[PDB]
Design a protein around this nucleic acid. Structure first.
Length: 655
DNA sequence: CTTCCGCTTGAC
DNA sequence: CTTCCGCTTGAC
DNA sequence: TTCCGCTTGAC
């Protein structure tokens, strides 16, 4: 007797906490969520199989009563916890303090149904003072907090399981829509049609080698066309003139000394990158150290388990006072006194107390990489490389700005009856910056002699905006407040599984069905796919957790419509049920599955139709008899949407 | 018959 | 052996 | 269906 069972969200924290407690405590992990709604009507128990609300898994007619089942991938976890409950005398529900962690603790209470005393406690780190403080300040469950995420969970269920049937009815079966999916897909589709309407505009100049390289700036009274001078349609924004291949080569002129007009100097200040999070660490790990994303996490798990770094899964880049002081104290003693900022540098992000902290070395006194190189070697060399990378960005984030000086020279030259202008930009490091840990001659008096050695016609062309990658997409989602670190990787795979997005190298390319689904949701569910929907939802979830709004009243307004309570976008417009009801009856399916692109020379529209065997290009044309018998050509995925111009449209029709 | 977001990957 | 291609990030 | 950077430089 006299033993306690402590349950944590993550197996890693479970192992590290078990190392600090010893006997008398049994530390286990819930592997995240143990319960969920049924994914299908065939998953509900036999009591509610006939009830009409079984497809949703919540009884929206009876105050949105949810139906929870043990997740099949967590039955092994649940059965172990139930078995270990019979061997202890107290239960410590020590999940995370966020609304997801509070609901896991709530689900653990409901699933275990313990007959022994239960205490709810939260900690932010695995250290003896953090464990002691959490143990000497327990509390009960926060139902307003569990009602917050339950409202979120049911919100996502209503969104997905009610709007997806509309897609099956108007586009294709098995298609889906989600508060994150449909927005993440829309981000990619919006990028694609931005480069379908994009039109290029080429221009030339001269970038000659007058260890120095100068470029064209102006020619006589006018300037030279730069990349920042043309809009999306190839139109020059209203003075300058584009030097083409013919005119620029005529101004090539043999060897002539060039003058110098200006050589002013002015200093700059370079800022250090903020500390690492789970997202920004894998980027730099795959770049300067050539590690995989799963290889970085696997290594980062062991460094944290040995007390080298902090927790790996963090959407926060802030530092604690103990960390901000240890980094500044170590930096000052390591290098110099003037090598630090006057005040500590705090790097805070959005979705503001976020219990999560940046990935940084552990302890109130940081350990140099030199100190751990003697301890990490052999088959542990890969571990030391990640620590040095983590230690470097943590101490460099607390040192004084890197100061340099840029020299903006201005080279001069003549050419017949036209005074052309040249210029070039240089830069040199004058102050030893944060880069020390990790991150001929350029002197010229105004009016010197410098002959032209090389000469070349610089060929240029404006380029469409680049496609999103996995890194850049989750960045756009982060700045919008969409998604979570645990779902970022998952949401990328899900939008590929149903054929919304395929990958070409590192770029994410949307399929044609993504265009059709986005068009439906933009023209008929405009509020559900608004980029601001999740943020406005989060603001309303704050009021439910704060006690200023009940879960049932909010859901009743969102689904059935309502003006009373916290104001909601879909609620004041009649609710979700009325919106999916009207769209199931008023949407012309023959119109939403025909993606309009352009007209050909005969002025007739060409569509992309989403058929049962993939997309196919279709066009209506007069046939043998003067009637609108039509033309189709099956559309292979080998050509992206922006590549489908009028030519290849006619080349497929000529096939 | 489809369909959602979210949560973790220890060693008994 | 004799076979081939989205340039993305982000300086200051 | 083997394997892949740097130089310009968004702001």
């Amino acid at each position: 007797s006299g033993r306690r069972l402590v349950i944590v969200e993550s197996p890693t924290k479970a192992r590290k906490l078990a190392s600090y407690l010893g006997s008398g405590y049994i530390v286990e992990s819930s592997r995240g969520h143990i319960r969920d709604l049924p994914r299908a009507a065939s998953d509900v128990p036999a009591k509610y199989k006939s009830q009409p609300w079984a497809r949703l898994g919540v009884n929206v007619d009876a105050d949105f009563e949810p139906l929870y089942i043990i997740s099949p991938e967590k039955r092994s976890t649940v059965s172990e916890l139930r078995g270990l409950l019979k061997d202890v005398d107290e239960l410590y529900l020590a999940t995370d303090g966020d609304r997801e962690g509070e609901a896991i603790a709530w689900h653990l209470l409901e699933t275990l149904k313990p007959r022994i005393p239960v205490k709810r406690m939260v900690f932010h780190e695995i250290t003896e003072p953090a464990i002691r403080a959490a143990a000497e300040h327990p509390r009960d469950l926060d139902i307003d907090l569990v009602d917050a995420q339950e409202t979120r969970r049911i919100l996502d269920r209503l969104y997905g399981y009610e709007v997806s049937p509309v897609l099956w009815k108007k586009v294709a079966p098995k298609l889906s829509a989600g508060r994150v999916q449909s927005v993440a897909t829309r981000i990619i589709v919006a990028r694609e049609r931005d480069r379908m309407a994009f039109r290029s505009a080429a221009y030339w100049d001269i970038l000659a080698k007058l260890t120095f390289s100068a470029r064209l700036t102006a020619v006589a009274g006018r300037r030279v066309a730069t990349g920042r001078d043309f809009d999306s349609l190839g139109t020059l924004r209203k003075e300058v003139i584009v030097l083409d291949e013919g005119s620029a080569t005529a101004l090539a002129a043999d060897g002539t000394q060039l003058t110098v007009a200006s050589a002013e100097e002015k200093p700059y200040a370079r800022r250090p990158y903020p500390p690492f999070m789970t997202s920004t660490l894998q980027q730099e790990a795959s770049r300067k150290l050539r590690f995989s994303a799963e290889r970085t996490m696997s290594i980062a798990q062991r460094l944290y388990e040995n007390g080298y770094i902090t927790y790996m899964r963090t959407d926060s880049t802030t530092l604690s006072e103990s960390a901000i002081n240890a980094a500044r104290t170590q930096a000052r003693q390591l290098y110099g006194d003037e090598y630090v900022a006057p005040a500590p540098r705090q790097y805070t992000r959005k979705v503001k107390q976020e219990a999560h902290e940046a990935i940084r070395p552990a302890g109130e006194t940081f350990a140099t990489p030199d100190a751990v190189r003697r301890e990490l070697d052999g088959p542990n060399i890969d571990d030391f490389r990640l620590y040095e990378l983590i230690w470097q960005r943590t101490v460099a984030s607390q040192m004084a700005d890197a100061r340099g000086m840029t020299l903006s020279l201005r080279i001069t030259g003549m050419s017949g009856h036209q005074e052309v202008v040249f210029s070039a930009t240089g830069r040199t490091l004058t102050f030893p910056g944060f880069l020390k840990a990790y991150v001929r001659l350029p002197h010229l008096t105004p009016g010197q002699r410098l002959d032209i050695v090389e000469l070349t016609p610089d060929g240029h062309a404006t380029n469409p905006p680049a496609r999103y990658t996995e890194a850049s997409l989750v960045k756009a989602l982060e700045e919008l407040g969409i998604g979570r670190p645990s779902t970022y990787s998952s949401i990328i795979k899900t939008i590929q599984d149903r054929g919304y997005v395929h990958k070409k190298g590192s770029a994410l390319v949307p399929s044609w069905v993504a265009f059709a689904v986005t068009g439906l949701l933009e023209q008929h569910f405009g509020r559900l796919v608004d980029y601001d929907f999740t943020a406005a939802m989060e603001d309303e979830l704050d009021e439910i957790a704060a006690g200023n709004e009940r879960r049932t009243n909010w859901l009743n307004n969102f689904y059935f419509g309502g003006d009373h309570g916290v104001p909601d976008s879909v609620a004041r417009s009649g609710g979700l049920k009325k919106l999916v009801g009207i769209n199931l009856e008023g949407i012309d399916a023959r119109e939403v599955n025909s993606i309009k692109l352009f007209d050909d020379t005969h002025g007739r529209p060409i569509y992309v139709r989403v058929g049962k065997n993939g997309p196919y290009l279709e066009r209506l044309v007069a046939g043998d008899t003067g009637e609108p018998t039509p033309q189709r050509a099956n559309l292979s995925d080998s050509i992206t949407p922006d590549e489908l111009t009028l030519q290849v449209a006619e080349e497929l029709f000529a096939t």
